[PDB]
Amino acid sequence: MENFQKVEKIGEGTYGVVYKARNKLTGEVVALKKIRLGVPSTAIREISLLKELNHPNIVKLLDVIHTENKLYLVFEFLHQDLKKFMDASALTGIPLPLIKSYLFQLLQGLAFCHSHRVLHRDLKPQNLLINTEGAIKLADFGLARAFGVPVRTYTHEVVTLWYRAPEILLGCKYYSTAVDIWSLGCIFAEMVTRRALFPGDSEIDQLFRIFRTLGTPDEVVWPGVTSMPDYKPSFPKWARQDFSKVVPPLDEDGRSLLSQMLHYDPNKRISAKAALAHPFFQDVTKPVPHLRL
Ligand SMILES: NS(=O)(=O)c1ccc(N/N=C2\C(=O)Nc3ccc(C(=O)O)cc32)cc1
Numbered sequence: 001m002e003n004f005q006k007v008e009k010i011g012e013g014t015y016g017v018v019y020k021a022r023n024k025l026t027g028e029v030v031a032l033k034k035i036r037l038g039v040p041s042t043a044i045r046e047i048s049l050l051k052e053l054n055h056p057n058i059v060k061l062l063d064v065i066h067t068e069n070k071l072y073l074v075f076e077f078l079h080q081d082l083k084k085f086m087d088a089s090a091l092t093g094i095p096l097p098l099i100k101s102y103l104f105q106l107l108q109g110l111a112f113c114h115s116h117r118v119l120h121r122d123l124k125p126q127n128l129l130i131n132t133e134g135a136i137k138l139a140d141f142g143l144a145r146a147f148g149v150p151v152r153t154y155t156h157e158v159v160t161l162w163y164r165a166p167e168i169l170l171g172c173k174y175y176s177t178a179v180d181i182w183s184l185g186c187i188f189a190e191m192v193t194r195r196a197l198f199p200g201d202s203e204i205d206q207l208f209r210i211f212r213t214l215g216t217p218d219e220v221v222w223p224g225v226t227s228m229p230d231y232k233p234s235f236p237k238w239a240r241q242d243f244s245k246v247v248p249p250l251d252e253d254g255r256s257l258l259s260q261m262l263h264y265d266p267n268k269r270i271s272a273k274a275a276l277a278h279p280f281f282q283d284v285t286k287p288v289p290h291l292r293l
């Protein structure tokens with residue numbers, strides 16, 4: 001670690017603290033992530049697999065440094081996250097062609113992850129990174145279930161529940177790649193409307209916000225929902241609202257795709273591969289964002 005000079009702290013999450021840093025050996029500017037914990041052997045092996053999960057839309061994992069019973073991950077550095085870009089673009093909105101490009105690229109990255117049986121599990125605007133060339137990349141995944149212990153909130157953590165799939169909220173512990181499609185759907189809606197789709201601050205508030213818009217799920221729309229671990233027959237039964245309120249003024253192709261990404265039944269929810277073929281992407285392009293760095 002004496003080979004890195006910290007420039008500034010750029011983030012913190014369940015798995016650690018991220019710094020912008022300079023590699024003293026090469027002069028490179030990188031993102032250095034100190035993993036919050038020595039470190040178990042299963043975590044070293046699982047993280048080593050992430051070094052081989054390489055794609056243009058996945059943040060590059062350059063090196064794994066396991067020394068003095070501490071774990072550091074060295075990643076390539078990108079200058080801005082989607083949360084900041086969304087906030088910077090709040091008065092005008094991100095242009096639809098750029099929203100479409102970002103969605104397409106993130107579906108390409110997820111289709112790749114998913115084909116290798118790797119789930120992101122916690123997609124949110126803060127872990128989607130952008131550059132000046134129009135790329136967007138997935139970050140902050142691959143360490144879940146590798147440390148062998150139940151997840152406990154770290155000191156000062158406030159968990160973001162806004163993008164969590166309903167099956168996670170309902171207590172499914174063996175959920176599928178569909179959870180990432182749900183999260184990406186929520187982010188897509190937020191890019192279009194400039195408002196979070198389901199901004200809950202508790203698990204039940206999150207679940208009830210989903211139900212009030214999409215309707216309380218039942219066995220008709222989601223076979224098996226009533227047998228989910230945290231499903232209660234006492235949930236209020238809200239009717240599904242007319243979808244026209246969800247993402248105005250998005251066109252029917254985008255609304256159709258979003259409705260497939262937000263299906264309750266994870267088995268009915270569209271896959272990343274099928275979403276890439278949706279008519280909404282027939283006119284996809286790769287525009288340049290205006291980034292103020
Ligand atoms: N792939 S890259 O990001 O374009 C890049 C850029 C710069 C570098 N430099 N490497 C080195 C540099 O300047 N002094 C060095 C001293 C020692 C070593 C070494 O391997 O032992 C490497 C460098 C690499 C990649």
Ligand SMILES: NS(=O)(=O)c1ccc(N/N=C2\C(=O)Nc3ccc(C(=O)O)cc32)cc1
Pocket residue numbers: 010011013018030031033059075076077078079080081082084085127129139140141
């Ligand atoms: N808020 S901001 O100023 O727009 C910002 C936020 C984040 C960044 N970079 N983050 C990262 C980066 O460059 N490589 C990474 C690799 C992994 C992780 C992670 O969390 O696991 C984060 C980053 C820059 C500016």
